[PDB]
Design a protein around this motif. Structure first.
Motif, PDB file in Angstrom:
ATOM      1  N   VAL B 524       0.868  -1.202   0.000  1.00 35.47           N
ATOM      2  CA  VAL B 524       0.000   0.000   0.000  1.00 35.47           C
ATOM      3  C   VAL B 524       0.897   1.243   0.000  1.00 35.47           C
ATOM      4  CG1 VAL B 524      -1.771   1.300   1.259  1.00 35.47           C
ATOM      5  CG2 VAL B 524      -1.943  -1.191   1.056  1.00 35.47           C
ATOM      6  N   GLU B 525       1.941   1.274   0.846  1.00 36.89           N
ATOM      7  CA  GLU B 525       2.874   2.425   0.899  1.00 36.89           C
ATOM      8  C   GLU B 525       3.506   2.628  -0.486  1.00 36.89           C
ATOM      9  OE1 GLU B 525       5.522   1.719   4.213  1.00 36.89           O
ATOM     10  OE2 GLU B 525       4.042   2.486   5.617  1.00 36.89           O
ATOM     11  N   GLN B 526       4.024   1.548  -1.080  1.00 46.69           N
ATOM     12  CA  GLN B 526       4.642   1.593  -2.413  1.00 46.69           C
ATOM     13  C   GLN B 526       3.619   2.097  -3.444  1.00 46.69           C
ATOM     14  OE1 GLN B 526       7.868   0.958  -3.323  1.00 46.69           O
ATOM     15  NE2 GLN B 526       7.214   1.969  -5.199  1.00 46.69           N
ATOM     16  N   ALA B 527       2.373   1.644  -3.379  1.00 46.30           N
ATOM     17  CA  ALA B 527       1.322   2.111  -4.307  1.00 46.30           C
ATOM     18  C   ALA B 527       1.106   3.626  -4.171  1.00 46.30           C
ATOM     19  CB  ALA B 527       0.042   1.393  -4.067  1.00 46.30           C
ATOM     20  N   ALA B 528       1.075   4.121  -2.940  1.00 46.43           N
ATOM     21  CA  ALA B 528       0.882   5.557  -2.677  1.00 46.43           C
ATOM     22  C   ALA B 528       2.090   6.309  -3.238  1.00 46.43           C
ATOM     23  CB  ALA B 528       0.655   5.819  -1.197  1.00 46.43           C
ATOM     24  N   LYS B 529       3.300   5.780  -3.058  1.00 44.65           N
ATOM     25  CA  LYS B 529       4.517   6.372  -3.670  1.00 44.65           C
ATOM     26  C   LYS B 529       4.402   6.403  -5.211  1.00 44.65           C
ATOM     27  CE  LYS B 529       9.541   5.993  -3.714  1.00 44.65           C
ATOM     28  NZ  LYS B 529      10.649   5.145  -3.232  1.00 44.65           N
ATOM     29  N   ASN B 530       3.932   5.316  -5.820  1.00 49.23           N
ATOM     30  CA  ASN B 530       3.722   5.203  -7.280  1.00 49.23           C
ATOM     31  C   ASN B 530       2.813   6.350  -7.741  1.00 49.23           C
ATOM     32  OD1 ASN B 530       5.347   3.005  -7.276  1.00 49.23           O
ATOM     33  ND2 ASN B 530       3.716   1.453  -7.428  1.00 49.23           N
ATOM     34  N   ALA B 531       1.926   6.841  -6.891  1.00 47.11           N
ATOM     35  CA  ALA B 531       0.943   7.911  -7.204  1.00 47.11           C
ATOM     36  C   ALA B 531       1.454   9.303  -6.769  1.00 47.11           C
ATOM     37  CB  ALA B 531      -0.387   7.585  -6.568  1.00 47.11           C
ATOM     38  N   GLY B 532       2.713   9.422  -6.356  1.00 40.56           N
ATOM     39  CA  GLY B 532       3.328  10.672  -5.872  1.00 40.56           C
ATOM     40  C   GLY B 532       2.834  11.097  -4.504  1.00 40.56           C
ATOM     41  N   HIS B 533       2.348  10.181  -3.657  1.00 40.38           N
ATOM     42  CA  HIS B 533       1.864  10.483  -2.277  1.00 40.38           C
ATOM     43  C   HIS B 533       2.835   9.882  -1.237  1.00 40.38           C
ATOM     44  CE1 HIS B 533      -2.319  12.298  -2.893  1.00 40.38           C
ATOM     45  NE2 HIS B 533      -2.001  11.857  -4.141  1.00 40.38           N
ATOM     46  N   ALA B 534       3.221  10.659  -0.228  1.00 36.79           N
ATOM     47  CA  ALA B 534       4.036  10.177   0.907  1.00 36.79           C
ATOM     48  C   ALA B 534       3.089   9.634   1.986  1.00 36.79           C
ATOM     49  CB  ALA B 534       4.862  11.323   1.451  1.00 36.79           C
ATOM     50  N   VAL B 535       2.976   8.315   2.152  1.00 40.74           N
ATOM     51  CA  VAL B 535       1.972   7.736   3.081  1.00 40.74           C
ATOM     52  C   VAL B 535       2.643   6.715   4.005  1.00 40.74           C
ATOM     53  CG1 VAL B 535      -0.276   6.592   3.161  1.00 40.74           C
ATOM     54  CG2 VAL B 535       0.259   8.151   1.305  1.00 40.74           C
ATOM     55  N   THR B 536       2.278   6.748   5.274  1.00 39.03           N
ATOM     56  CA  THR B 536       2.640   5.692   6.258  1.00 39.03           C
ATOM     57  C   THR B 536       1.380   4.930   6.635  1.00 39.03           C
ATOM     58  OG1 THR B 536       2.650   7.429   7.880  1.00 39.03           O
ATOM     59  CG2 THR B 536       4.806   6.631   7.158  1.00 39.03           C
ATOM     60  N   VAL B 537       1.440   3.606   6.512  1.00 40.70           N
ATOM     61  CA  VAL B 537       0.313   2.711   6.855  1.00 40.70           C
ATOM     62  C   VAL B 537       0.600   2.176   8.247  1.00 40.70           C
ATOM     63  CG1 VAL B 537      -0.928   0.628   6.168  1.00 40.70           C
ATOM     64  CG2 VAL B 537      -0.028   2.155   4.416  1.00 40.70           C
ATOM     65  N   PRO B 538      -0.327   2.369   9.196  1.00 40.59           N
ATOM     66  CA  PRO B 538      -0.150   1.866  10.545  1.00 40.59           C
ATOM     67  C   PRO B 538      -0.005   0.337  10.501  1.00 40.59           C
ATOM     68  CG  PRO B 538      -2.327   2.942  10.329  1.00 40.59           C
ATOM     69  CD  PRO B 538      -1.678   2.890   8.970  1.00 40.59           C
ATOM     70  N   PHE B 539       0.684  -0.208  11.498  1.00 36.88           N
ATOM     71  CA  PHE B 539       0.856  -1.668  11.620  1.00 36.88           C
ATOM     72  C   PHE B 539       1.015  -1.995  13.089  1.00 36.88           C
ATOM     73  CE2 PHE B 539       3.817  -5.154  12.271  1.00 36.88           C
ATOM     74  CZ  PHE B 539       3.044  -6.177  11.786  1.00 36.88           C
ATOM     75  N   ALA B 540       0.285  -2.979  13.571  1.00 39.49           N
ATOM     76  CA  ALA B 540       0.385  -3.448  14.968  1.00 39.49           C
ATOM     77  C   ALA B 540       0.915  -4.881  14.948  1.00 39.49           C
ATOM     78  CB  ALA B 540      -0.963  -3.331  15.619  1.00 39.49           C
ATOM     79  N   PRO B 541       2.135  -5.141  15.468  1.00 40.69           N
ATOM     80  CA  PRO B 541       2.615  -6.515  15.585  1.00 40.69           C
ATOM     81  C   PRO B 541       1.891  -7.262  16.705  1.00 40.69           C
ATOM     82  CG  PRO B 541       4.162  -5.021  16.638  1.00 40.69           C
ATOM     83  CD  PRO B 541       3.136  -4.160  15.928  1.00 40.69           C
ATOM     84  N   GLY B 542       2.158  -8.553  16.773  1.00 41.14           N
ATOM     85  CA  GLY B 542       1.682  -9.402  17.871  1.00 41.14           C
ATOM     86  C   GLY B 542       0.828 -10.567  17.429  1.00 41.14           C
ATOM     87  N   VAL B 698      -6.404   4.087   3.500  1.00 41.10           N
ATOM     88  CA  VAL B 698      -5.406   3.575   4.474  1.00 41.10           C
ATOM     89  C   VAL B 698      -6.142   3.221   5.753  1.00 41.10           C
ATOM     90  CG1 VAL B 698      -3.426   4.234   5.919  1.00 41.10           C
ATOM     91  CG2 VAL B 698      -3.414   4.662   3.446  1.00 41.10           C
ATOM     92  N   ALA B 699      -7.099   4.049   6.184  1.00 39.41           N
ATOM     93  CA  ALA B 699      -7.866   3.784   7.417  1.00 39.41           C
ATOM     94  C   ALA B 699      -8.631   2.465   7.293  1.00 39.41           C
ATOM     95  CB  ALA B 699      -8.833   4.912   7.759  1.00 39.41           C
ATOM     96  N   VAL B 700      -9.361   2.244   6.199  1.00 40.26           N
ATOM     97  CA  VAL B 700     -10.185   1.002   6.102  1.00 40.26           C
ATOM     98  C   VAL B 700      -9.272  -0.230   5.881  1.00 40.26           C
ATOM     99  CG1 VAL B 700     -10.693   1.239   3.647  1.00 40.26           C
ATOM    100  CG2 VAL B 700     -12.204  -0.096   5.120  1.00 40.26           C
ATOM    101  N   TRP B 701      -8.169  -0.081   5.157  1.00 40.28           N
ATOM    102  CA  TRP B 701      -7.154  -1.163   5.007  1.00 40.28           C
ATOM    103  C   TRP B 701      -6.662  -1.614   6.397  1.00 40.28           C
ATOM    104  CZ3 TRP B 701      -5.426  -4.495   1.578  1.00 40.28           C
ATOM    105  CH2 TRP B 701      -4.214  -5.140   1.843  1.00 40.28           C
ATOM    106  N   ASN B 702      -6.279  -0.657   7.235  1.00 44.27           N
ATOM    107  CA  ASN B 702      -5.794  -0.918   8.604  1.00 44.27           C
ATOM    108  C   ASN B 702      -6.911  -1.583   9.420  1.00 44.27           C
ATOM    109  OD1 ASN B 702      -3.766  -0.695  10.813  1.00 44.27           O
ATOM    110  ND2 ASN B 702      -5.291   0.771  11.602  1.00 44.27           N
ATOM    111  N   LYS B 703      -8.124  -1.056   9.325  1.00 48.39           N
ATOM    112  CA  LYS B 703      -9.277  -1.659  10.002  1.00 48.39           C
ATOM    113  C   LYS B 703      -9.368  -3.160   9.647  1.00 48.39           C
ATOM    114  CE  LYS B 703     -14.252  -1.669  10.294  1.00 48.39           C
ATOM    115  NZ  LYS B 703     -15.406  -0.763  10.436  1.00 48.39           N
ATOM    116  N   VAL B 704      -9.328  -3.504   8.365  1.00 48.06           N
ATOM    117  CA  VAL B 704      -9.476  -4.932   7.974  1.00 48.06           C
ATOM    118  C   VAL B 704      -8.287  -5.737   8.549  1.00 48.06           C
ATOM    119  CG1 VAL B 704      -9.623  -6.522   6.016  1.00 48.06           C
ATOM    120  CG2 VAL B 704     -10.961  -4.402   5.981  1.00 48.06           C
TER     121      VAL B 704
END
Ligand code: HEM
Ligand code: HEM
Ligand SMILES: [Cl-]
Ligand code: NA
Ligand code: NA
Lengths: 712, 712
Positions: B524-542, B698-704
């Motif tokens: 998703v981050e790479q896709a946003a970069k491909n579109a000229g957008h600087a994006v961080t996708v949240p991630f929770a380990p565990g 990014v919000a709904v991706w993280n939600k899923v």
């Protein structure tokens, strides 16, 4: 799949209270439409709409090379659903783009009009709502064709799902009156709250009543339906003759050519409908109403040629190519231009309902004055077109942008400007103590503030405590408002106000509108104190007092509560069960089912009932704010039965002894019957609920007090 | 009042995505049921429940002076609506107190049972949900009557309106098969997702299939419906024989004596129904099912008497006093006690469906084992009762309170405990760079992480990316998961994992479950970069990795997506249109309509379609995160038509030239057709919406990615 509504078609529908959730709204919870609109370049939007008027799309060619008429009809239909009886319908939520209105027969081919506007909606995005754009487009159509509008206000926020409206009980589109579900009874009496003669019509049948081409009879339906949309005879004549200065009807071939309305069409139609198999299906071949009438010699230019034609010719009953009744000018030359063929001209034509403006004696006098004095016509039409398109926008505080008319109109229920410092927190505390020291009871204070604030309806944003119109005709004499008790409360509050305002410096003063609400707040704080709970009820000053001269008493009649479950009040007997009228009232007040439940339970034990009725007063500490209504209602020790005298009044008896404990109405007992409302009553009637009940009651009380506070 | 459903009864219903809003919920938006329950004195509640068992109320007198049998039925019915096909139904939301379940014929007189519990519900308030209370009451009933339960978990939050469940299409309660809306076809094939034989039954008909008293044929329906509620032969015998160790049925007179179900009853009934005109209408005179059967010599005490009777007599077909088919012991003495009259005893009796446990050869062997080894019967029943009553509660991390069984059960889809340090933000940046440097594409990363996470369903809280079960049978073999592509991505991710874990000290390691989700976030981050957008996708380990032996392959089959609109996937041709299956999937993923809209538009342009289908890929920059799907879908320059070959595939052609631009399915084009979905698409397809689209996506991706993260 079989649903609860299939099994139990008469059970109460609470889903109408839970529309417009943050869930369904694509905008952030922080989205503020007014903030977005106030930065719109409205001049740039109007230049784009102006260019659009003469840029024909081949999928729906522009009549006479100009979309103006189509867009005026679009904007008139957007606004034309409005009913004064409940304030529902109107342009203020952009509901034309949703079911059912997007697929009403009278809205046929307005799907094309809305699609033409997608490029401009797309360009400007969230800065201009569909709801504002539909009306603005109608204004720009008029301006582009030489008509000076009275002005425009933005601020209609978009909605994201259909409104729950009763449009009638017919199961057939355009069903003629006298069916199993007839909206007519007696001598052509249209059932409240309807304001149209047939399911799926805006006002009337352009052929005549139930298709009978009699202009005199049609005039009756016109006058009745327009009055039910807040328009008098002058406004009605100005609107109809004003609209029918522009454009044409579409009836080029038989209606059997026209396919499914948008909600029924195939997925490939991509939200459009009424696909016609008649020749090209559009432009010169268009079918919309099935009528084929072009009113004026210049359908793309403002003129006084509608009245010149109406009065200058005698009219002959004829049939469109679709078989609809319409009229043609006897002995006329071909003077009306063709929409597509610059070598063809047509005789003047009229609808039955146009001829109403000449053959109804009252309309005739106005139509003659407009004919003789077209400057009077233009001014009445401009004023009526503004009123039509803004009628449901609510207080003038909601009006946005640079084209808002400065003239204050009586129909706006205007509130005077506040010119002076407002009371502060310490002043509010002083006035609450003075109110409680006067001897006014909790019941008097809560009943009065409830009567003043609860006229608000979110359907057209009319009503509320702002204005102090409870002290004026006709509110002061409404039965629900208990006129003699109200007069005594207002006299005491006015003496408190006079003394407080007398003592001030710096021009600080408190309106009676504020003091009525603040007094109610003191009543709720006293009731909490009676229960052994110290709470502060929020209060926001800045309401002003309107005059009698600033109040239209006739327009105020539709706001009278003839049913108010929150006061256990029913003015008479209705078709509709009282619990259905309670949920209808909660919807108008913008209450959720939980808000409705806590508010009603609290008002019962505060003494808010009209006439000090004991019905639903399930407490031995009246004027204390407790959850007693819920604890007593849910007590399985009590058995309920309808009375011999009145099937709508129930006795609650000790199940063991038969002792009479309580009486209650359907509005009281529905909270112990309906499975969703009983679940809510259980939360408030639990042993852990006393603090939550008080908090929630104070919250919903304050919400109701503030419903009309668009100044905040 | 005619509704949109009346006019257009086949249009999609989005209201199922917007249920359970903050509006309908009486609790504050911060209310945390888990925290309330954790403070509950569960010991005190259970003492109150033990007291209630023998505190008979005159309005519904206790059989044998003990409510235990009624309460066990009540808890079994709360749990018994569950279907493995969609995870809907079950006890986990307390839906037995709402329409329609409160009024199902099979739930007759359970209104009485729930009303007996109101005083305990009132006393403890929000600290115990109805949902928890119904199950806890069933447990206490068993404990009261001598049966040791396997344990109990709290944490079933109450719900406040009916769940949107397909229970069938029949328009008559209890309709027998073969009608115009038959749930049966071919060789008694029950339609998915149903798990009962007739509308308003829990599982089967106690008289036999469609009322035919054949125990052998009845056994077939029992096996099928219990398997569709996640129960095998052993669990099914244990549950039926265990339940029917207690209490009795009620059919003392003709069913015609019994009046309106609760949702149909008068307001004076205060939420109760099935009021009976037969004699006293209650107690000795009770009518519930219409059958009159008491199974054991001690109906209020755990015994081995069910199987002693079943095997110890031969059975004669007879009729209850209501006219229902049931069975009496040939030549038996009057050994069964009467529920009210100490002077009366009765012969042993059985239902058709009880005799199934003897006359079905596979049940017979289990029943005989249970008869000969009563300890095996007691243990099997205790485990099956736990599973029945907790089957829809989700991961063990949701289980509250001091009675939770320590034993981890295969049916829970257990996740191993994490026993090591988790990756930090530095590690997550390093793993994402390695993933993107491997050559895995945006399409591969997004597709794999979607496949992993989107198995979750909020109906029974099964599924999701926790456990890395996408690498195990059967998920690794599912067609929708593209097994060959999946294998290649997992091989590359397992090599990155091995190298990262091999370099660590202090026991730090990353699970494959975590890496799959993190690798999808990198995509998703790479896709946003491909579109000229600087994006961080949240991630929770565990997340932890489950074994094959912790993954029941047959139970996992019901999570297989045979329709996933988010991947434009349909496994075959269904009777339900694809867009209805898309909304159904959105509901199981707990998505709103806006969330569903943004997610699907984003997935299309990221390359998440199964097989790299072009259907709905309305972009010339695939693997770039843009709103192209919306802008192109809404382009009126494109005209759409169904193909000759396939009515369910559409071609989008330039209106002017006829040139093919795009193809789409029903799932693609519904966003351009449905009036509410099109209003959402318009927001995301506007010129001001690119950054909103990216941030909502990014919000709904993280939600899923987090749906199953109850450990948080
Ligand atoms: C008794 C009240 C009215 C009746 C029965 C009526 C009836 C109709 C009918 C049947 C059409 C033709 C639809 C079609 O075939 O395309 C039409 C067109 C139109 N109406 Fe009215 N009308 C009424 C009032 C009004 C009002 C109040 C306005 C605006 C102030 C308005 C503005 C128009 C315009 C501009 C058109 C032309 C549409 C075009 O050029 O495409 N009408 N009306
Ligand atoms: C094939 C499956 C089943 C069938 C057809 C069935 C049928 C019935 C019927 C018809 C009644 C009588 C209702 C009345 O008239 O009051 C009943 C009662 C009962 N069932 Fe079942 N049942 C089944 C499975 C279960 C299971 C799995 C349980 C619990 C583990 C259970 C526990 C009970 C109890 C305790 C009662 C007695 C209620 C009382 O004393 O008021 N049953 N069952
Ligand atoms: Cl937003
Ligand atoms: Na309105
Ligand atoms: Na469920």
């Amino acid at each position: 799949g079989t649903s609860n509504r299939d099994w139990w078609p008469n059970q109460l529908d609470l889903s109408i209270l839970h529309r417009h959730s943050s869930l369904s709204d694509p905008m952030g919870k922080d989205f503020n439409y007014a903030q977005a609109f106030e930065k719109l370049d409205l001049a740039a939007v109007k230049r784009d709409l102006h260019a659009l008027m003469t840029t024909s799309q081949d999928w729906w060619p522009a009549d006479f090379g100009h979309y103006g008429g189509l867009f005026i009809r679009m904007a008139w239909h957007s606004a034309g659903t409005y009913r004064t009886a409940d304030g529902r319908g109107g342009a203020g939520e952009g509901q034309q783009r949703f079911a059912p209105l997007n697929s009403w027969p009278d809205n046929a081919n307005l799907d094309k009009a809305r699609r033409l506007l997608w490029p401009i909606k797309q360009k400007y995005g969230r800065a201009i709502s569909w709801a504002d754009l539909l009306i603005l487009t109608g204004n720009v159509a008029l301006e582009s064709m030489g008509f000076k509008t009275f002005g425009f206000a933005g601020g209609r926020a978009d909605t994201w799902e259909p409104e729950d409206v009763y449009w009638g009980s017919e199961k057939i589109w355009l069903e003629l009156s006298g069916g199993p579900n007839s909206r007519y009874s007696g001598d052509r009496q249209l059932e409240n709250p309807l304001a149209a003669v047939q399911m799926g019509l805006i006002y009337v049948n352009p052929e005549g009543p139930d298709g009978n081409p009699d202009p005199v009879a049609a005039a009756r339906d016109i006058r009745d339906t327009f009055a039910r949309m807040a328009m008098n005879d002058e406004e009605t004549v100005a609107l109809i003759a004003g609209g029918h200065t522009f454009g044409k009807t579409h009836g080029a071939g038989p209606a059997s050519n026209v396919g499914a309305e948008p909600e029924a069409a195939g997925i490939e139609a991509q939200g459009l409908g009424w696909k016609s198999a008649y020749r090209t299906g559009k432009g010169a071949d268009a079918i919309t109403s099935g009528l084929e009438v072009t009113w004026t010699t210049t359908p793309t230019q403002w003129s006084h040629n509608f009245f010149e034609n109406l009065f200058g010719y005698e009219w002959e009953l004829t049939k469109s190519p679709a078989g609809a009744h319409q009229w043609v000018a006897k002995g006329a030359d071909a003077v009306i231009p063709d929409a597509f063929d610059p070598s063809k001209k047509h005789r003047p034509t009229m609808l039955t309902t146009d001829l109403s403006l000449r053959f109804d004696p009252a309309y005739e006098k106005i139509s003659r004055r407009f004919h003789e004095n077209p400057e009077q016509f233009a001014d009445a039409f401009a004023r009526a077109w503004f009123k039509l398109t803004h009628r449901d926008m609510g207080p003038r505080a909601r009006y946005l942008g640079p084209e808002v008319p400065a003239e204050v109109l009586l129909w706006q229920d205007p509130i005077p400007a506040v010119d002076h410092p407002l009371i502060d927190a310490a002043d509010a505390a002083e006035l609450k103590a003075k109110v409680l020291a006067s001897g006014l009871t909790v019941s008097q204070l809560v009943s009065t503030a409830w009567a003043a604030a609860s006229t608000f309806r979110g359907s057209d944003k009319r009503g509320g405590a702002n204005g102090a119109r409870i002290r004026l005709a006709p509110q002061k004499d409404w039965e629900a408002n208990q006129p003699e008790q109200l007069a005594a409360v207002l006299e005491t509050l006015e003496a408190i106000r006079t003394a407080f305002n007398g003592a001030q410096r710096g021009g600080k003063q408190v309106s009676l509108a504020d003091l009525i609400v603040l007094a109610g707040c003191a009543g709720v704080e006293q009731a909490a104190k009676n229960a052994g709970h110290a709470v502060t009820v929020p209060f926001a000053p800045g309401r002003a007092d309107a005059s009698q001269e600033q109040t239209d008493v006739e327009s105020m009649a539709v706001l009278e509560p003839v049913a108010d479950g929150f006061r256990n009040y029913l003015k008479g007997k209705y078709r509709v069960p009282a619990e259905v009228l309670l949920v209808d009232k909660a919807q108008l007040l913008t209450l959720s089912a939980p808000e409705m439940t806590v508010l009603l339970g609290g008002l019962r034990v505060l003494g808010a009932n009209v006439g000090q009725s004991r019905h639903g007063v399930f407490t031995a500490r009246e004027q204390a704010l407790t959850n007693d209504f819920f604890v007593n209602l849910l007590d399985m020790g009590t058995e309920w039965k309808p009375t011999a005298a009145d099937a709508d009044v129930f006795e609650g008896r000790d199940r063991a002894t038969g002792e009479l404990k309580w009486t209650g109405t359907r509005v009281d007992l529905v909270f112990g019957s309906h499975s969703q409302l009983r679940a809510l009553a259980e939360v408030y009637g639990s042993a852990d609920a006393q603090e939550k009940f008080v908090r929630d009651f104070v919250a919903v009380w304050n919400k109701v007090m503030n419903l009309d506070r668009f100044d905040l």
